[PDB]
Amino acid sequence: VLFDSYRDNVAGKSFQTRLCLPMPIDVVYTWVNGTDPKLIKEVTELKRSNTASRFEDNEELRYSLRSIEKHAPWVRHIFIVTNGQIPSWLNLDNPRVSVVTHQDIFQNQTHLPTFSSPAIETHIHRIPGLSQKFIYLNDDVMFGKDVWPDDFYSHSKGQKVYLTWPADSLRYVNRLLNAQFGFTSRKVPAHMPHMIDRLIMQELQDTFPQEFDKTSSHRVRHSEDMQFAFSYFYFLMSAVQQLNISEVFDEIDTDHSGVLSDREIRTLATRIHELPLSLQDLTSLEQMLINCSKSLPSNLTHSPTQEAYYDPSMPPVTKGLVIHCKPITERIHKAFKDQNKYKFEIMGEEEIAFKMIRTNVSHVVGQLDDIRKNPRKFICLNDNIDHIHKDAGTVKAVLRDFYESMFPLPSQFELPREYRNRFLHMTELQEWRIYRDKL
């Protein structure tokens, strides 16, 4: 049915890969339980040699998974990157979710245990089995309306880039980018889910290998870290492809004969000269070709078909002749310059709802009611709460109420409420499984 249907066109050839969005698409999370005693002691020793808001969990991951089930049902697999911690409610019997530890993705184990989200984020593209294009969600980011892959990518325009107006980390990265790509004024990607291409990310990190190693080596956040989204999206937007002159030729050689006719030459002429095209512009190009055929070796200039030229001195204008004629290829490189290696589409921030949650209750109710009234595709409720403040518990309740109003149905990734995982850490679970199944 569908195999035949996609070949049912004048070309008799399938274009499904261009007519359909790229699949599969996995999701990657990072999650941490700040209440874990092993973490608190290990963090304590490190500092002895980062407030509770960085590691605190308001059940954000639980409800974000509910939002995927409701608003992104097309996701293939969900990877939850942790330091070894396991959420008590996570249903590990569901093959659609798995836990990935820092040990599994970090390259230098000396960087662990870590407590720096930038360091972790340098390695999440290394997850074995990860789809080439995946979407990274912070645990406190979730979907507020139905989303589809074209909210992140299209074949015609590439990845969407959601930029916003603005950090010492940006100065450091801006300096790197200025030196690599020249200067540009750079806005900041929104606090939202980010689609990442594993190959582009690796190409980026191969460009700045020492910097990403440095960022990974920082066990706490640091001013000279490679900002995950900022680094990726500006590498994607700034990577340059060098003009392929042989491909310029094949475009002009519309009968695929290997030789440029007079009418094909005119098109080349119009593309290295300002319009209107003068007779001097045209004859100059012709003279360049004739001078080049004489000067160049006959081996490089290389009759299946017979081309007749207005100028009886014009030799067969072959690809070889054009490739190695510097006067022409210079004007070509001058007339077309700086081709982006990747396509991308700048987006506004209309579909992002980013809220800094503090402890002023009246204000928090107002922020969440704005999302109730005005649904948004991308929601980020960032923790800036002060728990010592008396109104802290009230705020936490208002948040739970908002979350429950949007996503009241438990997901296939939640254990039943009466059950919980026996072990809080992956190493303990690995040991129990081996003891049980032992002979």
Ligand X SMILES: *[C@@H]1O[C@H](CO)[C@@H](O[C@@H]2O[C@H](CO)[C@@H](O[C@@H]3O[C@H](CO[C@H]4O[C@H](CO)[C@@H](O)[C@H](O)[C@@H]4O)[C@@H](O)[C@H](O[C@H]4O[C@H](CO)[C@@H](O)[C@H](O)[C@@H]4O)[C@@H]3O)[C@H](O)[C@H]2NC(C)=O)[C@H](O)[C@H]1NC(C)=O
Ligand Y SMILES: *[C@@H]1O[C@H](CO)[C@@H](O[C@@H]2O[C@H](CO)[C@@H](O[C@@H]3O[C@H](CO)[C@@H](O)[C@H](O)[C@@H]3O)[C@H](O)[C@H]2NC(C)=O)[C@H](O)[C@H]1NC(C)=O
Ligand Z SMILES: *[C@@H]1O[C@H](CO)[C@@H](O)[C@H](O)[C@H]1NC(C)=O
Ligand U SMILES: *[C@@H]1O[C@H](CO[C@@H]2O[C@@H](C)[C@@H](O)[C@@H](O)[C@@H]2O)[C@@H](O[C@@H]2O[C@H](CO)[C@@H](O)[C@H](O)[C@H]2NC(C)=O)[C@H](O)[C@H]1NC(C)=O
Ligand V SMILES: *[C@@H]1O[C@H](CO[C@@H]2O[C@@H](C)[C@@H](O)[C@@H](O)[C@@H]2O)[C@@H](O)[C@H](O)[C@H]1NC(C)=O
Residue 284, marked binder? no
Cα distances (angstroms) measured from residue 127 to each of 48, 204, 294, 347: 32, 17, 57, 28
The item of ligand X, Mg ion, ligand Y, none sharing an interface with residue 26, based on CB under 5 to 8 Å by kind, is none
Tokens of 197: 């291409």
Residue 255, marked binder? yes
Which residues between 149 and 208 bind ligand V (CB under 6 A)? none
Q: How far is the CB of 215 from ligand U (least distance, A)?
A: 10
Q: How far is the CB of 35 from ligand X (least distance, A)?
A: 4
Q: How far is the CB of 250 from Ca ion (least distance, A)?
A: 10
Among 9-17, 219-227, 285-293, 385-393, which window interacts with ligand V (CB under 6 A)? 285-293
Tokens of 404: 């429950």
The item of a copy of itself, ligand Y, Ca ion, none sharing an interface with residue 330, based on CB under 5 to 8 Å by kind, is none
Q: Please report whether residue 121 would count as binding Mg ion according to CB under 5 A.
A: no
Out of 177, 424, 425, 426, the only residue in the binding site for ligand Y (CB under 6 A) is 424
Residues near ligand UD1, by CB under 6 A: 30-32, 54-55, 115, 117-118, 120-121, 138-141, 169, 191, 227-229, 380, 382
Decide: 126 and 133 in contact? Cβ < 8 Å.
Answer: no
Alpha helices by DSSP H, listed for 253-335, are: 262-272, 279-295, 298-301, 319-323, 326-335
* Residue 278: partners with Cβ closer than 8 Å, 6 or more residues away: none
Alpha carbons 231 and 186: distance in angstroms, whole number:
11
The item of Ca ion, Mg ion, ligand X, none sharing an interface with residue 69, based on CB under 5 to 8 Å by kind, is none
Out of 26, 36, 121, 140, the only residue in the binding site for Mg ion (CB under 5 A) is 140
Q: How far is the CB of 396 from Mg ion (least distance, A)?
A: 12
Alpha carbons 240 and 39: distance in angstroms, whole number:
43
Pattern 110-139, ligand U, x by CB under 6 A = xx----------------------------
Q: Please report whether residue 108 would count as binding ligand U according to CB under 6 A.
A: yes
Q: Which of helix, strand or coil describes residue 436?
A: helix
Alpha carbons 357 and 350: distance in angstroms, whole number:
20
Which residues between 226 and 265 bind Ca ion (CB under 5 A)? 253, 255, 257
Decide: 64 and 137 in contact? Cβ < 8 Å.
Answer: yes
Q: Please report whether residue 291 would count as binding ligand V according to CB under 6 A.
A: yes
Out of 133, 191, 219, 355, the only residue in the binding site for ligand U (CB under 6 A) is 219
Q: What does the DSSP assignment read for 176-221?
A: HHHHHH------EE-SS-EEEEHHHHHHHHHHSHHHHHHHHH-SS-
* Residue 362: partners with Cβ closer than 8 Å, 6 or more residues away: none
Among 57-65, 111-119, 286-294, 342-350, which window interacts with ligand V (CB under 6 A)? 286-294
Q: Is the dihedral of CA 270, 276, 279, 284 positive or negative?
A: negative
Q: How far is the CB of 8 from a copy of itself (least distance, A)?
A: 6
Which residues bind to Ca ion, rule: CB under 5 A? 253, 255, 257
Please state the residue numbers annotated as binding site for Ca(2+). Answer: 253, 255, 257, 264
